[PDB]
Amino acid sequence: QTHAYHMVNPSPWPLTGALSALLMTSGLTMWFHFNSMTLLMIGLTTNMLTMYQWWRDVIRESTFQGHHTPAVQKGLRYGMILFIISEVLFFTGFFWAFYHSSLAPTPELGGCWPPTGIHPLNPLEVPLLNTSVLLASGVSITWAHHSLMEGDRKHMLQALFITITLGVYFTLLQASEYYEAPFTISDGVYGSTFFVATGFHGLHVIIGSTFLIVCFFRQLKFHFTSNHHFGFEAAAWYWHFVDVVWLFLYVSIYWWGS
Amino acid sequence: GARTWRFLTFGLALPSVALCTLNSWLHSGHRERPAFIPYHHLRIRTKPFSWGDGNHTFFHNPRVNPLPTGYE
Amino acid sequence: FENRVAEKQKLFQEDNGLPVHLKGGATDNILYRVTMTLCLGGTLYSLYCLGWASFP
Amino acid sequence: MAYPMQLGFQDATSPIMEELLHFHDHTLMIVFLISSLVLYIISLMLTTKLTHTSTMDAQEVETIWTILPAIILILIALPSLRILYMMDEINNPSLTVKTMGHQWYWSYEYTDYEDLSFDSYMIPTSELKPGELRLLEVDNRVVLPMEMTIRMLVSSEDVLHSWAVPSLGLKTDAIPGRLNQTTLMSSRPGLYYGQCSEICGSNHSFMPIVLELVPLKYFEKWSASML
Amino acid sequence: YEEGPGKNIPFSVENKWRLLAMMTLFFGSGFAAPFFIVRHQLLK
Amino acid sequence: GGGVPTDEEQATGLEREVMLAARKGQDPYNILAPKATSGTKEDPNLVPSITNKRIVGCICEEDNSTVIWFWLHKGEAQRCPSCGTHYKLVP
Amino acid sequence: YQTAPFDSRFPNQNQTRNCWQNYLDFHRCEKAMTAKGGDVSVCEWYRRVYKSLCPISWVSTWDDRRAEGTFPGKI
Amino acid sequence: ITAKPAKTPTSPKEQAIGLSVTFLSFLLPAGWVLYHLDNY
Amino acid sequence: MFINRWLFSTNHKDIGTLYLLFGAWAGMVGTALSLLIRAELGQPGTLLGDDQIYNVVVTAHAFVMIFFMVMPIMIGGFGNWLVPLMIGAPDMAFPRMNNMSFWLLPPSFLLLLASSMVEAGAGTGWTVYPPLAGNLAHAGASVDLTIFSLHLAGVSSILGAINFITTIINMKPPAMSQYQTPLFVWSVMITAVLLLLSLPVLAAGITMLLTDRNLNTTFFDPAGGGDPILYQHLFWFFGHPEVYILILPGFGMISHIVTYYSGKKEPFGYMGMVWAMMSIGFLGFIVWAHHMFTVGMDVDTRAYFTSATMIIAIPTGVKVFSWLATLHGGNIKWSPAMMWALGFIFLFTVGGLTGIVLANSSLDIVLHDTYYVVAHFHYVLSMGAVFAIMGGFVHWFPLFSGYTLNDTWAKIHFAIMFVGVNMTFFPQHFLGLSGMPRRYSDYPDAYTMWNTISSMGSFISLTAVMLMVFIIWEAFASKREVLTVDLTTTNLEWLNGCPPPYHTFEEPTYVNL
Ligand code: HEA
Ligand code: HEA
Ligand SMILES: CCCCC/C=C/C/C=C/C/C=C/C/C=C\CCCC(=O)O[C@H](COC(=O)CCCCCCCCCCCCCCCCC)COP(=O)(O)OCCN
Ligand SMILES: CCCCCC/C=C/CCCCCCCCCC(=O)O[C@H](COC(=O)CCCCCCCCCCCCCCC)COP(=O)(O)OC[C@@H](O)CO
Ligand SMILES: CCCCCC/C=C\CCCCCCCCCC(=O)O[C@H](COC(=O)CCCCCCCCCCCCCCC)COP(=O)(O)OC[C@@H](O)CO
Ligand SMILES: CCCCCCCCCCO[C@@H]1O[C@H](CO)[C@@H](O[C@H]2O[C@H](CO)[C@@H](O)[C@H](O)[C@H]2O)[C@H](O)[C@H]1O
Ligand SMILES: CCCCCCCCCCO[C@@H]1O[C@H](CO)[C@@H](O[C@H]2O[C@H](CO)[C@@H](O)[C@H](O)[C@H]2O)[C@H](O)[C@H]1O
Ligand SMILES: CCCCCCCCCCO[C@@H]1O[C@H](CO)[C@@H](O[C@H]2O[C@H](CO)[C@@H](O)[C@H](O)[C@H]2O)[C@H](O)[C@H]1O
Ligand SMILES: C[C@H](CCC(=O)O)[C@H]1CC[C@H]2[C@@H]3[C@H](O)C[C@@H]4C[C@H](O)CC[C@]4(C)[C@H]3C[C@H](O)[C@]12C
Ligand code: CUA
Ligand code: NA
Ligand SMILES: [Zn+2]
Structure with a gap:
């Protein structure tokens, strides 16, 4: 080749990923209808196996084999931005469901929002703490980024560790909230919108935290250079996306919808 | 630079978290649970849940989450 | 920790004809066989489950 | 038709x-x-x-x-x-009639003055009287006065239906929890046919609408007889 | 990998009659499937 | 506070080759658009190749949407069949 | 009274809230008049309008819920 | 487009076989099901 | 070597070939389902004796044709084969992720064929509206297997969209601007943008339906304060962009085919064609509620959706007139591909125009949920997509395979198909105007004649499908290997021969400024 692009070795992971999707969906069906978790647990296992080996191979190709030329890195930049945009539109559908329900509350609700019998969480208690936590993690991840560009191993690791710790604190605070909440997913459209929207957000926080932990261990193993660290940038963009989705949830569901 | 973002982390961001943590831990006491009313728009059961006895939500809290028939 | 990237660059650039998903050595082969066996077995099990659910 | x-x-x-x-x-x-x-x-x-x-x-x-x-x-x-x-x-409607969609038939409510209501089922092919229309006749027609503005309100007690009468220009979806309004005015007496116009399961094809348009005097006699 | 006409496909075109058998099974299985699913639902 | 490797210390494989070639002002991996000569028979556009032919796309005039594609062969300069611009292959 | 007149508060194809509002209005008035032993004939306009517009099954569901103590609107 | 002569020319008779086999592969299975709808 | 090549592919050409095979197979399934629909309607009374099965057949027909036939062939097949070749790129940006977009489709299809085999199927319509699609009116696994089928298909196309946008932005020759890329490449980039934005909204909506069926949510259930009409908004916010997704790549192939067989170096009004496709893609996001003119929305909303919908005719007309202006002055080669493309222009125009009729909410009251709508989309989508596919297939078959078709057979095939689809769908206009509802297993006796003719047309199109398989067999059986094609100076995909080597553009093109 006298181009800069990456011709990827033939790989089984697309097929194992596709089969993991079949096992997870057929597994959910077998859990909801046929009282069994077997297929679902095989599909969750094969999904984690697939993602581990696929992203391992991407590390091998880049850090160890040198395939990420500037042109390849630029492609991955576009790919992550476009992925985040698809994730924004996914959340938009849940925001649309929330505003649809809350702006025109039906007679079954008492014709009011929040519905009759719903006692919202106080948005100035743990929801406000969660907001300070994710905003603070946006500052610390930015400190990590700058440390890395400036060649500062120790301060990159400290900043990234602080960012992960905040992600975990949010997740434990939200788990605790969920358990103390006097309303459930089954408490009509108020519970439906609250738990499905904040639930998908919580999944994204765990995904994002997991990505940051991957970056933390790669940094510990000296994989990042001061100039080449796209996995760190991608995880930072993803992390900022998770913060911004939280801010929209906080204003919409917790504050305006209370 | 890194110096500025570290200054913001320790000088503003973590102090905010410390203060919201204090604010939260001062309002952390258990609220008195409201009288049970079997409202038809709440405690929805169109299909049994796929776990436990089919009638308990996933993060069911006996103290604050009544069943369709009331507090356990 | 010490910087051992050069030694991983040497391993993953060895002229041995292996594809990247197996180039780490025998452990790659075990993890590949576990994955593929679970996927193929799980898929055959999903088909059985379909045959079962297709009748009352 | x-x-x-x-x-x-x-x-x-x-x-x-x-x-x-x-x-x-x-x-x-x-x-x-x-x-x-x-x-x-x-x-x-x-x-x-x-x-x-x-x-x-x-x-x-x-x-x-x-x-x-x-x-x-x-x-x-x-x-x-x-x-x-x-x-x-x-x-200014002079009359309001409700229709509720069901799997698989229509009910009608005339509750301006009396609580009149009835169910309206397709006549099976095996029960049609000679000269009656396959898939279109009902046991109880929607009796309405001609040359008068009527308010129809449409809802459902189960899945989505759609209340249609092509010769009157009418099609209003029947949505549970929602009361949809349309206006009906027939220039003529007669029988005006329509069919359920939102897929509502196995008998979607078989829950028709039949309006029976009569002079006001006859509409009043029919209402009075229903007491 | 083999290159060139009849070599860039997951099926053989070495023998036109074996090919006709494979094409028949391939498109025929697809076309038959809805008739057999309808049969299946009727036999319930 | 250091301990982060640089591209110069740690880049490898094609990333490193691209990095070293750019330091010398060379473009072996075809990252940059080559700048046209006047394209006359005396001053033909010089098309590098690792082999004896290479596909040329000719944007005959600035802002043409239509690109003219042809194989350029080793040997005598060839001309764009749309604008007559000369191209010469330099293995 | 023939039927419920046009109501500029509810000018659109969705008349759900028109039915709901008149049902609430009638029962709020009936409570106000019964609570002094006053006279429920003052509430007659709201009664005629909700009976005209509201599905029988909605009226019947709401009535059951008022008697059960699960009606979610304020009366 | 220009093409080499056919490496393995398919005669009118070979075409009648391929066509017939192709049509039958569509018609026989569907025909069997539709013919037997009564029995189902 | 067989497993490495066809199960572990990282090759844009092999993956395109897998998508074409997958789509051709899916088209047989979708056609079988269409013939069962028309057999139930071909005489008055009942054929199947089971209207739930009819409803399942109609539902599966639509899902197979849209998700397994058109999008795989257009985007997965022609997209993967041609895009890299038309921009001189060595492969797709994400050649391994590309393989997973492909391998998600067989599992997606399996989930749909499982929906139909368990309980009584999903007899919902392809819209899957609650409450019919809910856990009371459709109890059991069928609707959940349909939701999961759509999730896998959704992920396949979202990842595929990321791959195409990235490849088309990042992997052109450095001198090539976006205004120097072929119209087919534009049509795929714009289709990929519509997919990236619309599929996530569908995924949100069908996830809400999943949770209403299984986790006691009430997004669509009035008892909990929910609204069935919310589902409709989410579904159609995706569903209108989806109909533009289905035709845009077809627009791109048509531009190439009309240009090629007119003997032109270029389509007429290149920048107008880019503008038109971008305009259609943008307007396609602000019109969705024309699928909801009978649900009881406000008059001013109806007025807005009528007006916005009609605007799309302007850019669309620019394309139609631009195709005609490409033919203008051409040395016309009456190839079978040209015939497909001329059929496309005409039939697409007819269906587009019945679209403009339906855009008028007032008339839509009477035409909504009738055979007029079915007539509209079988012209613009069913014939538009299919004619564009068959045109592209007969044009590029020799590039992909290395072998020529018999032109006379291909013309016979075109002729049979043109007669069949018109005999099938044209009479559906009459059925719709006269008031026959769609989604019916049987009809009042007055509708018998046009249903009879429509069903007889469906058999003509079946004869065309069977002949098409014969024609592909004859080309592989005879092995006439391509030597030369004309107009390679303006059709770069041909310049590496037929078929092109496994690896093309290892040495990229030279393009100067
Ligand atoms: C290829 C797919 C495709 C395309 C491109 C279109 C294109 C259009 N469609 Fe259609 N549509 C469908 C597929 C498609 N449609 C499907 C599948 C459904 C049903 C879904 C379901 O219910 O299952 C449907 C349903 C549908 C409805 C809902 C009807 C109802 O259910 O009651 C409406 C309403 O406005 C609509 C309108 C349009 C319009 C205005 C266009 C326009 O984009 C067409 C513009 C083109 C032209 C106008 C012709 C070319 C132009 C000229 C030659 C210029 C001059 C013309 C004029 C001045 C008018 N279509
Ligand atoms: C692309 C979309 C598409 C295609 C191609 C078709 C094709 C056909 N459809 Fe349609 N149809 C829909 C989309 C499509 N349909 C949708 C969305 C609905 C609404 C569902 C609902 O109500 O919920 C529907 C509904 C619908 C109805 C209404 C059902 C009802 O309301 O009760 C009818 C009635 O006749 C019908 C008939 C046909 C027929 C006879 C064919 C065909 O037989 C016409 C001829 C076409 C072919 C035969 C295809 C050939 C192509 C190949 C075989 C691919 C070859 C591949 C390669 C060369 C690579 N379909
Ligand atoms: C701590 C922070 C965040 C934690 C995240 C969640 C933990 C457990 C499950 C993980 C997956 C979550 C994703 C979102 C899905 C739906 C519901 C999740 C929200 C949640 O956890 O809500 C709980 C209910 O969970 C339930 O029903 C059970 C939930 C389990 C079954 C879910 C199955 C549904 C999966 C849907 C898959 C769709 C995938 C979309 C792919 C799209 C591709 C285009 C709330 O508990 P509760 O007792 O009602 O009220 C509290 C009372 N004190
Ligand atoms: C208990 C846990 C349960 C939950 C599990 C669910 C999943 C969790 C997974 C979290 C994601 C981990 C992703 C790790 C990716 C590691 C590979 C990587 O980061 O690869 C980098 C490239 O980035 C790239 O491909 C970028 C690749 C980006 C991957 C994007 C990941 C977001 C994934 C979202 C997953 C789906 C969510 C949808 C839910 C609806 C490699 O290049 P550099 O970094 O420049 O290195 C090279 C230098 O060393 C040279 O000097
Ligand atoms: C109900 C349950 C249904 C859900 C089933 C889930 C479906 C499938 C199972 C998913 C298995 C995932 C396995 C890992 C996939 C990793 C893809 C990846 O990371 O892809 C990268 C490209 O996409 C990029 O960057 C950016 C994009 C990264 C995307 C990561 C994958 C996420 C998949 C789920 C997201 C759906 C979207 C949610 C929005 C609605 C790399 O591309 P490659 O071609 O590989 O390499 C190129 C080389 O140059 C690298 O050195
Ligand atoms: C090398 C690979 C090895 C493959 C081994 C697969 C792992 C699981 C196999 C056992 O299957 C399980 O059997 C349990 C019954 O015997 C099920 O009980 C389930 O059903 C219960 C009903 O009592 C519910 O409480 C729960 O859903 C659950 O416990 C459980 O769901 C199911 O998974
Ligand atoms: C390596 C590749 C992977 C290979 C896959 C391994 C396949 C495992 C087969 C085990 O089958 C299980 O049998 C259980 C016991 O018979 C079922 O119990 C379930 O069904 C029971 C029926 O008695 C109920 O008690 C409960 O729902 C529950 O125990 C359960 O559904 C099912 O999974
Ligand atoms: C939607 C597309 C459908 C198009 C229809 C295709 C045209 C018909 C093709 C032939 O199909 C066959 O027809 C035979 C009758 O001609 C059937 O024999 C049946 O009837 C015979 C005589 O009547 C018996 O001898 C056999 O045992 C018996 O199976 C046979 O099953 C069936 O395969
Ligand atoms: C001593 C060691 C040196 C790492 C190295 O240079 O190889 C240092 C560098 C940065 C350190 C990390 C950062 O200080 C952040 C964390 C601080 C906590 O008190 C311990 C864990 C914690 C995650 C540290 C682990 C360990 O002490 C690290 C990894
Ligand atoms: Cu009721 Cu269709
Ligand atoms: Na019938
Ligand atoms: Zn030139």
């Missing part, structure tokens, strides 16, 4: 169906003309040995290709929107 080998709309029973007929004739003329011009221009492009294969300048012709269609759309939209606003225009 439709008749065999029918090409167009059922004859208008209401002033707004009449308006839709005139509006369809206008729009169809434009559809015909544009359809025909494209076919004709295809045949014109394909029937000469003369050639011009060098770069052609597109700027001037694209003015024509955008302005002419924009004018044509305005000429469709003006009458379209006039009729839209007529079918919304405040009227």
